[PDB]
From Swiss-Prot:
Protein's name in the database: Maltose/maltodextrin-binding periplasmic protein
Gene3D superfamilies reported in the protein's UniProt record: Periplasmic binding protein-like II
Lineage: Bacteria, Pseudomonadati, Pseudomonadota, Gammaproteobacteria, Enterobacterales
Keyword Transport: yes
GO cellular component, one term: ATP-binding cassette (ABC) transporter complex
The UniProt record lists the keyword Cell wall biogenesis/degradation: no
Role this protein plays: Part of the ABC transporter complex MalEFGK involved in maltose/maltodextrin import. Binds maltose and higher maltodextrins such as maltotriose.
Induction (record text): Induced by maltose and the transcriptional regulator MalT. Permanently repressed by cold shock in a PNPase-dependent fashion.
GO biological processes: carbohydrate transport; cell chemotaxis; detection of maltose stimulus; DNA damage response; maltodextrin transmembrane transport; maltose transport
UniProt keyword list: Periplasm, Signal, Sugar transport, Transport
Protein family (similarity comment): Belongs to the bacterial solute-binding protein 1 family.
Species of the source: Escherichia coli (strain K12)
PANTHER family: MALTOSE-BINDING PERIPLASMIC PROTEIN, MALTOSE_MALTODEXTRIN-BINDING PERIPLASMIC PROTEIN
Entry's localization field: Periplasm
A GO molecular-function descriptor: maltose binding
Gene for this chain: malE
Length: 516
């Protein structure tokens, strides 16, 4: 392996208490003589899967739980095995946030929700509604102050307002419906339009980012910001007289933050998995370990029952959990990163005027839907090609698109498979695909062949058509069970390598129109 044996390398994001975490590492080091190194890499959430995909990287990775499903799907995480006694030390819903396909894939650390943070000296009674913020900004501007500044470059911070009047990511009612995406519905449009109107009317600036908003609040220039518990330390230092409270309502509805559980995963490629377990269970997830990190930058409502009993007495934590209860724990489906990228682009483009709100959110909808919709089309095609019989089940949400895409794929794919039969036979013989482990190795090959050159729908049909050819083969040799992981692999390659192009074509609607 590439990861060094007999030491621990730990990666955590730069807005967390990494010096406090390093103190916990030093205690581990003192006991054992084993080196512990804490780093906070730039763009951590993208750097980790890049390096781990090659069998490299840190032993332990920290992030909110939403990204861990994708990491697990990609084989980048070890299944964790806490014993019953340890599990019973943390709240059950925090374990729920780090369960993926029935397996625990990380240790939960703390519950994060955004709150409204306000300067009591400027704004002793913070607004209950978003709607009153323009007038409040006018009053404050007369005094050389602004009402509100927060990070407009990460959709995490704008999401609560988008979700307020009915925007949603993937439909949840008790039960998910991942095919059902609510990124460009009327509620989402209303929320984002209100945000863009704030910018148009000079109550906010589209360029405001994390550092700019934090500095303005901590210098006493803006009366409000929106942030999580990690931000409280720097406000303490600034000596601003601040409060932490419920987010404003929009159209009478609560703002609904996406709630994260800061979690610690173990690299699948680590030769130090037992060391990592010992560190996390016996050093970090203890009253003294969490206090060391919390004293650096507050964690929020921690997963460890014994310590949370103390933290819960803090009105700032009470406010954190009040906001959390009005929001929703993030999914950890593997396309969460694509959802976030899609909405990130929509907010930035709407705020800058590069797109209208309507067209921005339409693109984010398509981007968010891409994986599940492509998988439905591709899986159905590969299966009916293997067996000869079509799936009689209803398509579900966006069913017309999925149905017409499959119809188009059948028609165009028939010609492609006929004309490419000799080429496909040759490639199949060269690849020698015998089983599920062989199928798992195909992703790298696909990416190599499919990434280079101009993208068009014909090439995408050839990708999927060779998939169907391989699926027929797998069926013939009594490996029919391999067809679904084959479809998942092809889908992953398609939507990752051609994301921007696919959104530009309006996804599968463009496919249907191109070949009408
Ligand atoms: C399911 C699967 C699909 C693949 O498609 C690669 C991109 C489409 C393609 C191209 C292309 O990108 O132009 N050329 C091919 C030649 C053959 Cl014989 C088969 C496929 C193509 C390639 C592989 C290795 C696998 Cl396993
Ligand atoms: O903005 C999209 C982003 O949102 C969340 O990231 C949060 C993170 O959970 C917090 O701990 C803190 O670091 O702020 C981040 C926002 O800048 C998701 O967890 C993340 O995956 C997503 O990209
Ligand atoms: Mg568009
Ligand atoms: Mg649609
Ligand atoms: Na007052």
């Amino acid at each position: 392996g590439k990861i060094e044996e007999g030491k621990l390398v730990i990666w955590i994001n730069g807005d967390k208490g990494y010096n406090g975490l390093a103190e916990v590492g030093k205690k581990f080091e003192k006991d054992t003589g084993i080196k512990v190194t804490v780093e906070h890499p730039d763009k951590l959430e993208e750097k980790f899967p890049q390096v781990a995909a090659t069998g490299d990287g840190p032993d332990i990775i920290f992030w909110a739980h939403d990204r861990f499903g994708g990491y697990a799907q990609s084989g980048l995480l070890a299944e964790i095995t806490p014993d019953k006694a340890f599990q019973d030390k943390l709240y059950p819903f925090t374990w729920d946030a780090v369960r993926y396909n029935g397996k625990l894939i990380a240790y939960p650390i703390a519950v994060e929700a955004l709150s409204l943070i306000y300067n009591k000296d400027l704004l002793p009674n913070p607004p209950k509604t978003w709607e009153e913020i323009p007038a409040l900004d006018k009053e404050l501007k007369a005094k050389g102050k602004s009402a509100l500044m927060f990070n407009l470059q990460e959709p995490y911070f704008t999401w609560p307002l988008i979700a307020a009047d009915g925007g949603y990511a993937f439909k949840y009612e008790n039960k998910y419906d991942i095919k059902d995406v609510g990124v460009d519905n009327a509620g989402a449009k209303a929320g984002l339009t209100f945000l863009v109107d704030l910018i148009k009317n000079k109550h906010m600036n589209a360029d405001t980012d994390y550092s700019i908003a934090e500095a303005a609040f901590n210098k006493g220039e803006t009366a409000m910001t929106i942030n999580g518990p990690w931000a409280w330390s720097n406000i303490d230092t600034s000596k601003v007289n601040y409060g932490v409270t419920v987010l404003p309502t929009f159209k009478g509805q609560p703002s609904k933050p996406f709630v994260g559980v800061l979690s610690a995963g173990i690299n699948a490629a680590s030769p130090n998995k037992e060391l990592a377990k010992e560190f996390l269970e016996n050093y970090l997830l203890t009253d003294e370990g969490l206090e060391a990190v919390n004293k650096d930058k507050p964690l929020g409502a921690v997963a460890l029952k014994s310590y949370e009993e103390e933290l819960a007495k803090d009105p700032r934590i009470a406010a954190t959990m009040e906001n959390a209860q009005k929001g929703e724990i993030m999914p950890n489906i593997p396309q969460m990163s694509a959802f976030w990228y899609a909405v990130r682009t929509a907010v930035i483009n709407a705020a800058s005027g590069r797109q209208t709100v309507d067209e921005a959110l339409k693109d984010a909808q398509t981007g968010s839907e891409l994986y599940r919709q492509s998988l439905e089309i591709i899986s159905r095609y590969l299966r009916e090609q293997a067996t000869g019989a079509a799936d009689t089940a209803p398509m579900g949400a966006s069913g017309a698109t999925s149905r017409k895409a499959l119809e188009t794929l059948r028609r165009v794919g028939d010609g492609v498979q006929r004309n490419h039969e000799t080429a496909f036979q040759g490639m199949l013989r060269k690849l020698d695909i015998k089983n599920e482990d062989d199928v798992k190795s195909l992703s790298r090959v696909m990416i190599h062949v499919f990434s280079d050159g101009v993208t068009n729908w014909g090439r995408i049909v050839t990708l999927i058509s060779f998939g169907a050819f391989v699926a027929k083969h797998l069926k013939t040799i009594n490996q029919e069970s391999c067809i679904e992981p084959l479809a998942e692999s092809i889908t992953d390659v398609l939507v990752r390598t051609k994301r921007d192009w696919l959104v530009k074509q309006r996804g599968w609607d463009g496919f249907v129109e191109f070949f009408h």
